[PDB]
Each structure stands twice: as C-alpha cells, then as structure tokens.
Design a protein around this motif. Structure first.
Motif, PDB file in Angstrom:
ATOM      1  N   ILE A 152      -8.649  -6.142   3.143  1.00  0.00           N
ATOM      2  CA  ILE A 152      -8.093  -7.472   3.404  1.00  0.00           C
ATOM      3  C   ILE A 152      -7.293  -7.458   4.709  1.00  0.00           C
ATOM      4  CG2 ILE A 152      -6.371  -9.100   2.566  1.00  0.00           C
ATOM      5  CD1 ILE A 152      -7.420  -8.399  -0.240  1.00  0.00           C
ATOM      6  N   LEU A 176       2.330   1.570  -3.527  1.00  0.00           N
ATOM      7  CA  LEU A 176       1.347   2.012  -4.514  1.00  0.00           C
ATOM      8  C   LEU A 176       1.043   3.519  -4.322  1.00  0.00           C
ATOM      9  CD1 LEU A 176      -1.041  -0.966  -4.516  1.00  0.00           C
ATOM     10  CD2 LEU A 176       0.543  -0.404  -6.343  1.00  0.00           C
ATOM     11  N   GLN A 188      -4.399   9.313 -18.863  1.00  0.00           N
ATOM     12  CA  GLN A 188      -4.040   7.972 -18.544  1.00  0.00           C
ATOM     13  C   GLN A 188      -3.370   7.904 -17.150  1.00  0.00           C
ATOM     14  OE1 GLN A 188      -2.329   4.708 -21.272  1.00  0.00           O
ATOM     15  NE2 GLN A 188      -0.575   5.243 -19.974  1.00  0.00           N
ATOM     16  N   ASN A 189      -2.549   8.892 -16.851  1.00  0.00           N
ATOM     17  CA  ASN A 189      -1.896   8.959 -15.550  1.00  0.00           C
ATOM     18  C   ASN A 189      -2.925   9.041 -14.421  1.00  0.00           C
ATOM     19  OD1 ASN A 189       0.605   9.071 -16.816  1.00  0.00           O
ATOM     20  ND2 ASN A 189       0.860  11.348 -16.475  1.00  0.00           N
ATOM     21  N   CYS A 239       0.818  -1.223   0.000  1.00  0.00           N
ATOM     22  CA  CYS A 239       0.000   0.000   0.000  1.00  0.00           C
ATOM     23  C   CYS A 239       0.848   1.268   0.000  1.00  0.00           C
ATOM     24  CB  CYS A 239      -0.971  -0.008   1.151  1.00  0.00           C
ATOM     25  SG  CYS A 239      -2.327  -1.137   0.935  1.00  0.00           S
ATOM     26  N   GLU A 249      -5.906  -7.169 -12.708  1.00  0.00           N
ATOM     27  CA  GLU A 249      -5.996  -5.765 -12.964  1.00  0.00           C
ATOM     28  C   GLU A 249      -4.591  -5.135 -13.113  1.00  0.00           C
ATOM     29  OE1 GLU A 249      -8.520  -3.617 -10.312  1.00  0.00           O
ATOM     30  OE2 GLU A 249      -7.910  -1.633 -11.193  1.00  0.00           O
ATOM     31  N   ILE A 264      -7.407  -0.297  -5.691  1.00  0.00           N
ATOM     32  CA  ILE A 264      -6.681  -1.476  -5.257  1.00  0.00           C
ATOM     33  C   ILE A 264      -6.171  -1.323  -3.804  1.00  0.00           C
ATOM     34  CG2 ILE A 264      -4.564  -2.741  -5.666  1.00  0.00           C
ATOM     35  CD1 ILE A 264      -5.096  -2.393  -8.698  1.00  0.00           C
ATOM     36  N   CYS A 265      -5.660  -0.157  -3.466  1.00  0.00           N
ATOM     37  CA  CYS A 265      -5.176   0.119  -2.100  1.00  0.00           C
ATOM     38  C   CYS A 265      -6.302  -0.040  -1.114  1.00  0.00           C
ATOM     39  CB  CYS A 265      -4.588   1.506  -2.014  1.00  0.00           C
ATOM     40  SG  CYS A 265      -2.902   1.622  -2.657  1.00  0.00           S
ATOM     41  N   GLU A 271      -8.973  -1.944  -1.426  1.00  0.00           N
ATOM     42  CA  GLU A 271      -9.196  -3.360  -1.302  1.00  0.00           C
ATOM     43  C   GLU A 271      -8.163  -4.039  -0.414  1.00  0.00           C
ATOM     44  OE1 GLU A 271     -10.276  -5.330  -5.152  1.00  0.00           O
ATOM     45  OE2 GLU A 271      -9.640  -3.384  -5.818  1.00  0.00           O
ATOM     46  N   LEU A 272      -6.882  -3.708  -0.572  1.00  0.00           N
ATOM     47  CA  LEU A 272      -5.854  -4.299   0.286  1.00  0.00           C
ATOM     48  C   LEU A 272      -6.013  -3.891   1.757  1.00  0.00           C
ATOM     49  CD1 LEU A 272      -2.783  -3.970  -2.003  1.00  0.00           C
ATOM     50  CD2 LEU A 272      -4.251  -5.978  -1.733  1.00  0.00           C
ATOM     51  N   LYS A 273      -6.475  -2.670   1.986  1.00  0.00           N
ATOM     52  CA  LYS A 273      -6.779  -2.222   3.369  1.00  0.00           C
ATOM     53  C   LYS A 273      -7.896  -2.993   3.983  1.00  0.00           C
ATOM     54  CE  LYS A 273      -5.074   2.351   2.337  1.00  0.00           C
ATOM     55  NZ  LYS A 273      -5.317   3.810   2.623  1.00  0.00           N
ATOM     56  N   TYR A 325      -6.075   8.132 -14.679  1.00  0.00           N
ATOM     57  CA  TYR A 325      -6.886   6.903 -14.703  1.00  0.00           C
ATOM     58  C   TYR A 325      -6.195   5.778 -13.916  1.00  0.00           C
ATOM     59  CZ  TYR A 325      -9.116   2.669 -16.308  1.00  0.00           C
ATOM     60  OH  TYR A 325      -9.689   1.421 -16.389  1.00  0.00           O
ATOM     61  N   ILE A 326      -4.901   5.604 -14.170  1.00  0.00           N
ATOM     62  CA  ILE A 326      -4.131   4.553 -13.480  1.00  0.00           C
ATOM     63  C   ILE A 326      -4.068   4.896 -11.986  1.00  0.00           C
ATOM     64  CG2 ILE A 326      -1.903   3.369 -13.254  1.00  0.00           C
ATOM     65  CD1 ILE A 326      -1.561   3.664 -16.265  1.00  0.00           C
ATOM     66  N   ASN A 327      -3.865   6.160 -11.637  1.00  0.00           N
ATOM     67  CA  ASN A 327      -3.885   6.595 -10.228  1.00  0.00           C
ATOM     68  C   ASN A 327      -5.184   6.183  -9.546  1.00  0.00           C
ATOM     69  OD1 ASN A 327      -4.923   9.018  -8.430  1.00  0.00           O
ATOM     70  ND2 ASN A 327      -2.749   8.944  -8.202  1.00  0.00           N
ATOM     71  N   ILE A 339      -2.923  -3.071 -16.240  1.00  0.00           N
ATOM     72  CA  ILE A 339      -2.272  -1.789 -16.047  1.00  0.00           C
ATOM     73  C   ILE A 339      -0.869  -1.818 -16.620  1.00  0.00           C
ATOM     74  CG2 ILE A 339      -1.378  -0.101 -14.413  1.00  0.00           C
ATOM     75  CD1 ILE A 339      -3.912  -0.796 -12.665  1.00  0.00           C
ATOM     76  N   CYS A 396      -7.262   3.721 -10.443  1.00  0.00           N
ATOM     77  CA  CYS A 396      -7.262   2.267 -10.323  1.00  0.00           C
ATOM     78  C   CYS A 396      -6.440   1.806  -9.117  1.00  0.00           C
ATOM     79  CB  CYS A 396      -6.739   1.569 -11.595  1.00  0.00           C
ATOM     80  SG  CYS A 396      -7.748   1.825 -13.096  1.00  0.00           S
ATOM     81  N   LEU A 397      -5.260   2.398  -8.970  1.00  0.00           N
ATOM     82  CA  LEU A 397      -4.340   2.009  -7.874  1.00  0.00           C
ATOM     83  C   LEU A 397      -4.924   2.409  -6.533  1.00  0.00           C
ATOM     84  CD1 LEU A 397      -0.735   2.713  -9.433  1.00  0.00           C
ATOM     85  CD2 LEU A 397      -2.069   0.563  -9.455  1.00  0.00           C
ATOM     86  N   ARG A 398      -5.614   3.538  -6.472  1.00  0.00           N
ATOM     87  CA  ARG A 398      -6.337   3.921  -5.256  1.00  0.00           C
ATOM     88  C   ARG A 398      -7.374   2.904  -4.834  1.00  0.00           C
ATOM     89  NH1 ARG A 398      -8.683  10.001  -4.923  1.00  0.00           N
ATOM     90  NH2 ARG A 398      -7.255  10.309  -3.126  1.00  0.00           N
ATOM     91  N   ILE A 445     -10.868 -13.737   0.157  1.00  0.00           N
ATOM     92  CA  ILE A 445      -9.656 -12.889   0.057  1.00  0.00           C
ATOM     93  C   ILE A 445      -8.795 -13.310  -1.146  1.00  0.00           C
ATOM     94  CG2 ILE A 445      -7.485 -12.313   1.159  1.00  0.00           C
ATOM     95  CD1 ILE A 445      -8.971 -12.424   3.816  1.00  0.00           C
ATOM     96  N   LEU A 480       2.705   9.327 -10.649  1.00  0.00           N
ATOM     97  CA  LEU A 480       1.715   9.488 -11.711  1.00  0.00           C
ATOM     98  C   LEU A 480       1.057  10.854 -11.650  1.00  0.00           C
ATOM     99  CD1 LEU A 480       0.184   5.928 -11.685  1.00  0.00           C
ATOM    100  CD2 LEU A 480       1.486   6.899 -13.553  1.00  0.00           C
ATOM    101  N   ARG A 530       1.462   6.297  -7.197  1.00  0.00           N
ATOM    102  CA  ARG A 530       0.388   7.241  -7.524  1.00  0.00           C
ATOM    103  C   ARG A 530       0.985   8.668  -7.530  1.00  0.00           C
ATOM    104  NH1 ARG A 530      -3.640   7.172  -3.508  1.00  0.00           N
ATOM    105  NH2 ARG A 530      -4.757   8.478  -5.036  1.00  0.00           N
TER     106      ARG A 530
END
Lengths: 27, 30, 27, 30
Positions: free
Chosen positions: D26, A20, D8-9, A17, C19, D19-20, D22-24, D11-13, C23, D15-17, C9, A27, A24
């Motif tokens: 988990i 990432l 695109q930058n 995290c 995903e 994902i972060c 989701e990992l939080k 958009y990817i930012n 990317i 997406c990664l947000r 999970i 980016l 970001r």
C-alpha cells in the motif's frame, strides 16, 4: 494536497509496520 | 509464567486495537 | 483512476482490520 | 499447553508478517 496527505498516511503505515515487527519479536 | 503470558496477551491486544483505529482513520481519509 | 486505486487500498485495509480483530480474539 | 502456546505464537507472527507485507505494498502504491 493529495501528495501531502499521502505522505502523512505513508509515515503512519511505516510506523505501524515497525510496531508490528516489534510485536512479532515479542511473539 | 501464566500471569505474565495473560498480561502479554492483553498488552498485544491493546496494541492491535490502536493499530486498527489508525487504519480506520486512514480508510476514512482515502 | 486515483479513486479506483483508493477503493482497492481501502478494501484491503478493511480486510486487515477484520483479520486483526480475529487475532485479538485469539489473544 | 506450552507447545500449543508456542505454535499459536508462531501462527500469529506469520499472520502479522503477511499484514506487514500488504501495508508495504500500500505504501508503495501511495
């Protein structure tokens, strides 16, 4: 035992995290 | 500008590859 | 119960991996 | 080229947000 493994998995997830968040920023 | 952009693209790709590897390891352990 | 949660999970982790592969292709 | 690149930058930012987040989730469940 399970709790131990989860602690190491959770540290890795927190590290990912942070990585990432740095990506970001780039980016 | 463009070579720096292309390098950054490749650098981020490599970081994301490493992260994917780590998530695959976590999946196996779960 | 634990096994159930881990299955959900792990599906999420696999989806994230897909995903991130998409990317990387964009990159 | 540059506005597409900047989009695109962003958009990817985003997406990664996601994902972060989701990992939080988990992490909390583990």
């Amino acid at each position: 035992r399970q709790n131990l493994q989860n602690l190491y998995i959770n540290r890795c997830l927190r590290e990912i995290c942070q990585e990432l968040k740095e990506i970001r920023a780039m980016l």
